[PDB]
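Case study B.
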Amino acid sequence: SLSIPTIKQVRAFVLRGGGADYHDQGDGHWIDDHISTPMGKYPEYRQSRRSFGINVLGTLVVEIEASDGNVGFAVTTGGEPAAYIVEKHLARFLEGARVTDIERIWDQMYNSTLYYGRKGLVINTISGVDLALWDLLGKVRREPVHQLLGGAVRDELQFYATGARPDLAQKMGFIGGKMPLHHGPSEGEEGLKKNLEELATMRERVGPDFWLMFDCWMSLDLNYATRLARGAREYGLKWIEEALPPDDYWGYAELRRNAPTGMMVTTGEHEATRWGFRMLLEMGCCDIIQPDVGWCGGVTELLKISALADAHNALVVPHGSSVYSYHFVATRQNSPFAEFLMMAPKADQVVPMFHPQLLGEPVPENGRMRLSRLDQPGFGVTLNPECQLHRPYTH
Amino acid sequence: SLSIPTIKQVRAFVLRGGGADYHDQGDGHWIDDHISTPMGKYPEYRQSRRSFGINVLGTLVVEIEASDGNVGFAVTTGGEPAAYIVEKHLARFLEGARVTDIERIWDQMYNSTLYYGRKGLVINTISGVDLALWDLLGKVRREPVHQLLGGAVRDELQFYATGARPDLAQKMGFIGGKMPLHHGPSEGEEGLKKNLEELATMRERVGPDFWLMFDCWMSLDLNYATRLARGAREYGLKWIEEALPPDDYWGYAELRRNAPTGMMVTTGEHEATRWGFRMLLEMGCCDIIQPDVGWCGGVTELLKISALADAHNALVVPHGSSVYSYHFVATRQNSPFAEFLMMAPKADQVVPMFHPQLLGEPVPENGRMRLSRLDQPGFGVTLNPECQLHRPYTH
Amino acid sequence: SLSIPTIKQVRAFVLRGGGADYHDQGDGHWIDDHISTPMGKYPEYRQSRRSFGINVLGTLVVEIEASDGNVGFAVTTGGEPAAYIVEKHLARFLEGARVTDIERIWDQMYNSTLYYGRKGLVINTISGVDLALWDLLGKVRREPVHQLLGGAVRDELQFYATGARPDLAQKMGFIGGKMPLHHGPSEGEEGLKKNLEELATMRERVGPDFWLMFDCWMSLDLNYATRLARGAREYGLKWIEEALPPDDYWGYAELRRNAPTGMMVTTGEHEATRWGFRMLLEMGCCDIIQPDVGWCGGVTELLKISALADAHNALVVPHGSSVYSYHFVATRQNSPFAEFLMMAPKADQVVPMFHPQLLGEPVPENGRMRLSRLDQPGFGVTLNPECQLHRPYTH
Amino acid sequence: SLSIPTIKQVRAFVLRGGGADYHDQGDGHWIDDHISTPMGKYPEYRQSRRSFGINVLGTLVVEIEASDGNVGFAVTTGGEPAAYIVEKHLARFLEGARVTDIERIWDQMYNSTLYYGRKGLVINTISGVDLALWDLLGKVRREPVHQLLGGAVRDELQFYATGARPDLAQKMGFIGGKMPLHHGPSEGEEGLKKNLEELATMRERVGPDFWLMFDCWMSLDLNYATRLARGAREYGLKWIEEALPPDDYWGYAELRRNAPTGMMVTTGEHEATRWGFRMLLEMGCCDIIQPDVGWCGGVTELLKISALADAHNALVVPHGSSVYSYHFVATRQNSPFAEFLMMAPKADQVVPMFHPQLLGEPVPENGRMRLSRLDQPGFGVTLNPECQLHRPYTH
Ligand SMILES: [Mg+2]
Ligand SMILES: [Mg+2]
Ligand SMILES: [Mg+2]
Ligand SMILES: [Mg+2]
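Model:
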């Protein structure tokens, strides 16, 4: 049988400016233009999410070198504190292990960090290592990750675009456009009117069939979300996303019940592990779960989260994670379409989602992506040599 | 990247005499010695399960030849009627497909047979094909199946033994002994006393720590099972298995609630798909689910069933399926120990579980199985040339 | 009215060796002596919790300097990664604020870190800052923290002692002794017998009335915990703590239902926020919630958690946090007794809980602590000059 | 540390004519002009609430003198019978106690009156003493009560006005207008038509965005309330308040379910303690709880009620209690806006809510109140020397 290499060393680097950390941006970007958030109730933190620190972490790069010379890697959000965790804590569970010990390594990472993990940063870190491991395994086997995950179930991926210009997204071939909500509860009725006006304007431009969705980034309360959803019915809003904070399971269940018949309620990008998603599904909190592969626990855990959704006959549409989501969703019956975040400042052109960190990163063409483009080993990308890496720790 | 072969042809064969169909035995075997079943209420069908036709199907052998010459295969219960389904119906979804299209092929087999499937024989058939596909993928990758399923999470498997001699199993290093219940409700109080006498005798021989369990093969009613469990508490019975018919979800939940504190209720060998097991788990029907990989939908579906169990923090101890279960359970955190069926007529020695069909089949060595022993490609076994195959159908 | 000062600067430091991070110990300590944990299923990580990295973070020291010269501080678990969060992210919400803006500062810290927080390390960090804020407010007001929290409701605190020697704790005046469980599920029946033997031995030494408890540090599964509790009834075990991982709300509810009548099930030291505890209380997961003030969100959030418990008429016995818990529990009707960790290596004498970091730290005197002893401003302690602080980051 | 004074004496006085007892009015006031109540079914008690005795108690004034000369006080509804309770019963728990023993004193007051308390008058009395204690503590510390309650979370309070002239309230800067319902179930369809006509007239005058609410003072039945709410949908009614009697928890839950999507159901001004509000929240009886600080148990208990609402992510908008509510709500994230009762006979001008009892009482200016106006110690008000006090009892 094939001689399986062992893991020689694990390394963590930090990278800043775009890439995995969607919000690690500069000035003039739609993704930081008055997005409604839980902090919006404070005027001083309403115009910019960066002002309250959404960009304090940056990107965590994890590299895993095997005894055969192969090197797998992945990028996610975490930066220096995450690098500390990788170098000082998690490395011990990987070094010396066979590259195929995926399930065992994940279990040790999760159980060993349980005392300060469960959700958030620690899970982001575990996800990063996990992705790097799958990248390495793919490289060792000389096959793309989708083939290690049961194979694709569709010949191409179809995308909806997230950004402030759903009208421009339609012209680019996308199947729908998810817009950021710009006004929250603290802006009262005037803000609600402005929210609905924005949706109305886009509906007029795109026609009655193009999909339109609202992303609320955990910024509303039950009543406001209920009224926004009801008011959006007139414009055929397909779904309302992350209306409430992730810990409010009860509120999501109520919102889904009070929502217009046919309109979906989605959430999950800030939820983690099979247990977090079990709570969402069992309490009937949403119609679509949206875990981020780089934050929910990685591919190993997403496989379990996905199977849970399968049993619940629920749709799983991961929070756009570049090739990390593309390789995964291609193999899932429960993920008929995918999210493509428009990282161009004015959302007026398609650019790689994790630009400029990944070389070889495919992007939708007329809103689609042929599976044939994901034919390289692992996740099929290489780290851009132009991105200055920083290794804050060693072990 | 590696050149993935396509599937050239699928073939179905029938084999009789032992093997995958555990009950396809001759005379004098403990496995057919007055085992309590739902038919026990009829004196004419009480002594032998073969009398009511538990051995009417025999073994289904599925072979899948790839364009590179590799041939994967698997064995399960189904015989001629299953071969008909494989050759006349399922073959079309596999031939021409890339060997890595596992998820897509499974979905097509299940959705195309829904009108006459869901559970039973049709799922057994789908499972056999699925197993042959995983064997083939392992051979193409030149790796044992456990490495394709996330890698082992333990260095060895530990087994409990199923048969009429738990005392002898103890001497052979097994961690426990599950014995068949010989008397059902129609045999009244005398039968109940006999059941408890057999347990008492074995408990006396093995000491207070050795695990002892009762397998009831769907033969009881709620009250009888309740009383049997209570009476068995005095002997520290670890669990009572398949006390009721598979369709009685409600009864299982009630039984589990009325069971002695600490004693477990298990079931599942006659349950199929992620949805069947979701019902068992959500309704609180059992403490351990026991799907048979060759009957529940195969490895592909068992992965999803297992993930569901993970979310429910439930134990999964698959019904023994020789190498097909060994390779799978080795990779699951939720499967700490495994079942080994004692197929020797008097359960007084260890013999290959699927004897005589599988050459190279590993047997437990003093109740354990080092993972280092499962180092060959696929499921690591070959079809015994001695077994005369029969090809009932072609396509 | 009193002139309220503003916050001039917040600083984060890292300290190693004992202190707030209970597990940051050296060799020969009972607290690292074969404690049962979720990693115990791996022989390599069974003897020492330090081997899997329970001591990788160390202590986070937060200092908050006000415009009047007063400086509040606190210690908790978090180290360098937590310091990064404090300096690079949280500082902005405090500097310039009036020292009395506690509720507003907490809300901003939590809502600004939601995208990578909710539980774990980020909450530990928020908790440390919150504790330093309360220490500062107490110093500005020139009053002990208990007087800022509604005043004491008892004249003295009474403690139960946690460590491997409940017998010695009895001789030192404590009201009970909580001992660490040393064997988990992977150690089977032999381990279960050993666990019960240790309990039996201690019960024999202390008599039938002295309280005895078992701390399981998230290491069991439902069935094992069920059997351990039943076996411990013979020895009058008062409660079984953290039997299951924090994310298994469903399992806890089941365990509490199957627990011996009168025996309590407790958990919560690894749970955070009002919402995490709402889930525990509403689902009937435990009889006593045990949040750690330095990990659950700080005093500000613990006040809300405590009020929730009040409505549920539930007991709240916070995980011991030295003066940070003493000042809080003294004011709560729902916290009749408190936890005191025996940090002496052999748990054979009383030493300061957060030794050697806090000068002026009060120790129980014959198992009790008169409130008259907590008469100094804030939390009444000073940073030990001996401890060499490290300032990893600035802002 | 600061030397904390003790309580020297507690005194209770009675005051009549306006003030704390909102309904202790004379002729010609909107607050007594055909308000719908549970007694409305009797024609003789329909025109005036005073006719059935809503004004039989008057105001209870509680004074607490400390050893340092400081004197705290508060006003609420209770009069002579409440004074009896204060002087003859509650005084014993306060005199001799340190002014900071807030939690202990409250507990003793509640537990000692449990046999004839729980809700109603007795709790009003406890609330009065509790407020006087917080006023005293604020005076001793020389800080406004909001700073003792975690500090303000907003720079100003925004108010909606309660009275028969929401149109005039809009012109005065208020954010909304809550109108009293004038017709109940016994007036049949004619009365329902008149109720909706009144709402229609006000909606025409104020425009589509100004908030309009209906206060029903416990006067309806489930069906009538359901039909009124449905009929008010046309006029964008924001919420329907106290539709049913306080003991009908089941009815409130049903009403909230049958209510127009987006319209809120509120109640609680006649509910008391953490347990009363737990029942409301857990049974899903309302979207907003409206405890009166002077009737629900005081600030000490409202802190617990508020925390409960926090866990339930529910809005808390206290039933206008002058400075007693202002100081509290300023510190709560869950109380974004406040109620201001228009005590002017024709609701055509702003006058102090507790006029003429409190000197130094702030009032909304153009519908808002800067937190800077609540800068005096305690609740910042003094008893008006012109109000003839009466001390019916001594002890
Ligand atoms: Mg989103
Ligand atoms: Mg069985
Ligand atoms: Mg503990
Ligand atoms: Mg009202």
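The two ends of chain D are 33 Å apart (CA to CA). The remaining cases will be described in the next quarterly update.
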